């Protein structure tokens, strides 16, 4: 028991968690909701020899997100948290990796075009003066 000691109860419990990368719009919508209590529902469909994972955006939030799994054998990922009370703890070990991709093919690029425009909004460039400053 010490300040620098790390709690390993989560690891001893063999806790399994999933690591998922999500786009900005999905995260931005969740940030916009400010954590009202729900942002969507994750649906998992398993067949005789295949597994399908997808996420559905909340209808209220909007006013499909198929999930692609990735092999975890390439790395050992574990989640550790730093509590505000200065008590580090190990949440668990990542057991699956997934990635979120959009459903729209071409119309999505229109959103990106605006996003690139938004990103380039504060990019200042030289201005032309009709008259010489006096």
**Would you call 96 helix, strand, or coil by DSSP?**
strand
128 binds other proteins (CB under 8 A): yes
Distances (CA, A) of 130 to 76, 125, 133: 62, 16, 9
Residue from 63, 118, 121, 132 in contact with other proteins (CB under 8 A): 132
Question: Restricting to residues 76-115, which ones interact with other proteins according to CB under 8 A?
Answer: 76-85, 88-94, 99, 101, 109, 112-113, 115
63 binds other proteins (CB under 8 A): no
Please, which residue, 63 or 118, has the CB nearer to other proteins?
Answer: 118
* DSSP 8-state code for residue 108: H
62 binds other proteins (CB under 8 A): no
Cα–Cα dist 101/30, whole Å: 16
């Amino acid at each position: 028991a010490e300040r620098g000691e790390l709690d390993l109860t989560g690891a001893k419990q063999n806790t399994g968690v999933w690591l998922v990368k999500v786009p900005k719009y999905l995260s931005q919508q969740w940030a916009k909701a400010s954590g009202r209590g729900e942002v969507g529902k994750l649906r998992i469909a398993k067949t005789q020899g295949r597994t399908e994972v997808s996420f559905t955006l909340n209808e209220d939030l909007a006013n499909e997100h198929p999930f692609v799994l990735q092999s975890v054998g390439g790395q050992t990922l574990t989640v550790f948290t730093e509590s505000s009370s200065d008590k580090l703890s190990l949440e668990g070990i990542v057991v699956q990796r997934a990635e979120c991709r959009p459903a729209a093919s071409e119309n999505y690029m229109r959103l990106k075009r605006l996003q690139i425009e938004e990103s380039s909004k504060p990019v200042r460039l030289s201005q032309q003066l009709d008259k010489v400053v006096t």
